[PDB]
Amino acid sequence: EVQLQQSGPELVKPGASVKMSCKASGYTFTDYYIHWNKQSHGKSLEWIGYIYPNNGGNGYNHKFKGKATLTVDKSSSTAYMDVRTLTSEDSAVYYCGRSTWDDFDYWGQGTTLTVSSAKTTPPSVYPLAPGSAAQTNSMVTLGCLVKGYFPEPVTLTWNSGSLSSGVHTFPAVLQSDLYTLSSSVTVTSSPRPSETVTCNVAHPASSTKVDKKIV
Amino acid sequence: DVLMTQTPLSLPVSLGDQASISCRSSQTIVHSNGNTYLEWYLQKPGQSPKLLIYKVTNRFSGVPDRFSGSGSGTDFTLKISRVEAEDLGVYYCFQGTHAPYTFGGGTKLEIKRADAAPTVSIFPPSSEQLTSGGASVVCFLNNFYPKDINVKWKIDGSERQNGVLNSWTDQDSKDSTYSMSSTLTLTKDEYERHNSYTCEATHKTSTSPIVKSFNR
Numbered sequence A: 001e002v003q004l005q006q007s008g009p010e011l012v013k014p015g016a017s018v019k020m021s022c023k024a025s026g027y028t029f030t031d032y033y034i035h036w037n038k039q040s041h042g043k044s045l046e047w048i049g050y051i052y053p054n055n056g057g058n059g060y061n062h063k064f065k066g067k068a069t070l071t072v073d074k075s076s077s078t079a080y081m082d083v084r085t086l087t088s089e090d091s092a093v094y095y096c097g098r099s100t101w102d103d104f105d106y107w108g109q110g111t112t113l114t115v116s117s118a119k120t121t122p123p124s125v126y127p128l129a130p131g132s133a134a135q136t137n138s139m140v141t142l143g144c145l146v147k148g149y150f151p152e153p154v155t156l157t158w159n160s161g162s163l164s165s166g167v168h169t170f171p172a173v174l175q176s177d178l179y180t181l182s183s184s185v186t187v188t189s190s191p192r193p194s195e196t197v198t199c200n201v202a203h204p205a206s207s208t209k210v211d212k213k214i215v
Numbered sequence B: 001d002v003l004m005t006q007t008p009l010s011l012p013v014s015l016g017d018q019a020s021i022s023c024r025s026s027q028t029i030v031h032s033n034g035n036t037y038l039e040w041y042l043q044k045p046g047q048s049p050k051l052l053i054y055k056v057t058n059r060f061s062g063v064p065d066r067f068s069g070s071g072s073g074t075d076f077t078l079k080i081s082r083v084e085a086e087d088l089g090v091y092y093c094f095q096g097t098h099a100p101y102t103f104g105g106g107t108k109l110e111i112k113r114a115d116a117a118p119t120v121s122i123f124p125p126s127s128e129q130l131t132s133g134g135a136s137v138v139c140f141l142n143n144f145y146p147k148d149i150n151v152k153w154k155i156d157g158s159e160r161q162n163g164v165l166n167s168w169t170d171q172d173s174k175d176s177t178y179s180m181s182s183t184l185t186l187t188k189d190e191y192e193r194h195n196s197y198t199c200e201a202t203h204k205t206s207t208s209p210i211v212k213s214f215n216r
């Protein structure tokens, strides 16, 4: 399968530059154009330009020409976008897409680019038990509070991944430039407290993993 | 640059119903090769846009037959027969005829259904947060519908607002509801100085609150 492994969220101060890539496996990297698209705050979509991996033929949207630089690595099947002169407006989700002469094909997963002059500050994971809400005797709701972490990416998980049903992980809101997440797993009375419910939080930009539980 | 306008911005529909998302071009996007490059993308939340329809009329490999696009050079329409739950997401039309290639604004397909009163949960400050010095009172209003549903935090009866951050989870695709999180954050300092915490839930399902509370 056309597995485009576009990857890595990362933050960069303004003025700086960044180089993101897409791995094309499953096919002939030289046969299809690789395109670059900008998904601005999970909302707006804009086209940056393309690159064709057999001759290096390329083109850009005049609006991204002064900051975008597209290149390819033919021997390792990878395309790269170089974003430079990074002001706040550059922080966004960038997709890499495959296109035949006529149409787009498979888009890559996505790259998050936080343009920030700020530091990386790990999440404070405080576990939540009831004692005051919808009783624990039939089906109970537990929570995990991930607060005060920067930058934006953290994934909340449960029971080593051994509790995927009934979980509501809400998005994050930013307090004074920190992000606060909260998720909740509605489990049976039998499970908590009888059994262990472990909250697994991960935050790349700080190398922070903390597996928690409660009373 | 060719402008792409996607009406409606938001389209609510129930299950088994039909949906029609329009997209129009500031000018013809019929290519000289004699082809119209208008694409239809469906981006599910927490995902990337995937291709549904290419060249107005054609459907991508493995896309269900319920989606059908059509249009005339300047006006296009994506059509859905019997909206299903997994059809939530933002719908996009794209033009790869004139450069630079533009994307239409997008369209929201939330799914209408039967009202559901939220299962409300309240959580006092966990132990570590106190030892550390702050206090966060959390409240999970899960599995509800419709979306407009207010939450007022009241301390010892008195309404409270500043220090509260609410977050909405996207409309679940398996059941068609929402979940919200309200977190009354207040310094342990101002917290120990009180007894009861009320997370009240106003909403449009049954016109009567669901109140959760705790006292320290």
Ligand SMILES: c1ccc(C2(N3CCCCC3)CCCCC2)cc1
Binding pocket: A033, A050, A099, A100, A101, A102, A103, A104, B031, B037, B095, B096, B097, B101
């Ligand atoms: C390089 C290769 C293909 C294109 C597209 N288009 C194909 C038909 C003819 C006009 C340009 C539009 C953008 C998405 C891919 C298709 C642009 C640039």
